[PDB]
Amino acid sequence: RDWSSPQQPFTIYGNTHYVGTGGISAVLLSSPQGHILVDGTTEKGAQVVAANIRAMGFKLSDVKYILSTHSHEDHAGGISAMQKLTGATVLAGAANVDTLRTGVSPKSDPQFGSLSNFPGSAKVRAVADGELVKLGPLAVKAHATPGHTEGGITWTWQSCEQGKCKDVVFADSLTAVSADSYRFSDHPEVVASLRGSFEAVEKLSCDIAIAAHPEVNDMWTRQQRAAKEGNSAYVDNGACRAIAAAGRKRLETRLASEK
Ligand SMILES: [Zn+2]
Ligand SMILES: [Zn+2]
Q: Where are the domains of the chain?
A: 1-259
Taking Cα atoms as reference points, which of 204, 214, 216, 213 lies closest to residue 240? 204
Edge to edge, what strands does the sheet with 124-127 contain? 10-13, 16-18, 27-29, 35-38, 63-67, 89-93, 124-127
At residue 28, what is the residue type?
A: L
Residues contacting residue 68 through CB under 8 Å, at least 6 positions apart = 39, 40, 75, 76, 79, 90, 91, 92, 93, 96, 100, 153
HSE of 210, CA atoms in CB hemisphere, 13 A: 28
- What is the distance between the alpha carbons of residues 127 and 23, in angstroms, rounded to a whole number? 27
Give the method used.
X-ray
Q: What is the resolution of this structure in A?
A: 1.6
Superfamily of domain 1-259, CATH level 4: Ribonuclease Z/Hydroxyacylglutathione hydrolase-like (3.60.15.10)
Q: Compute, in angstroms, the gap from residue 4 CA to the centroid of ligand 1.
A: 15
Taking Cα atoms as reference points, which of 135, 171, 173, 175 lies closest to residue 156? 171
Q: Compute, in angstroms, the gap from residue 125 CA to the centroid of ligand 1.
A: 20
Q: Compute, in angstroms, the gap from residue 70 CA to the centroid of ligand 2.
A: 8
Q: Compute, in angstroms, the gap from residue 42 CA to the centroid of ligand 2.
A: 10
Look at phi and psi of residue 181 and say left if phi exceeds 0, alpha if psi is from -120 to 50, else beta: alpha
- What is the distance between the alpha carbons of residues 250 and 259, in angstroms, rounded to a whole number? 15
Taking Cα atoms as reference points, which of 167, 172, 166 lies closest to residue 197? 172
Helices (H) and strands (E) in the chain, counts: 7, 12
70 known ligand binder: yes
Task: Quote the Cα angle for 57-47-232, to 5°.
Answer: 50
- What is the distance between the alpha carbons of residues 199 and 244, in angstroms, rounded to a whole number? 7
The answer to whether 221 and 1 have CB atoms below 8 angstroms apart is: no
Q: Name beta bridge partners: 170.
A: 155, 210
74 known ligand binder: yes
- What is the distance between the alpha carbons of residues 162 and 37, in angstroms, rounded to a whole number? 23
- What is the distance between the alpha carbons of residues 117 and 104, in angstroms, rounded to a whole number? 5
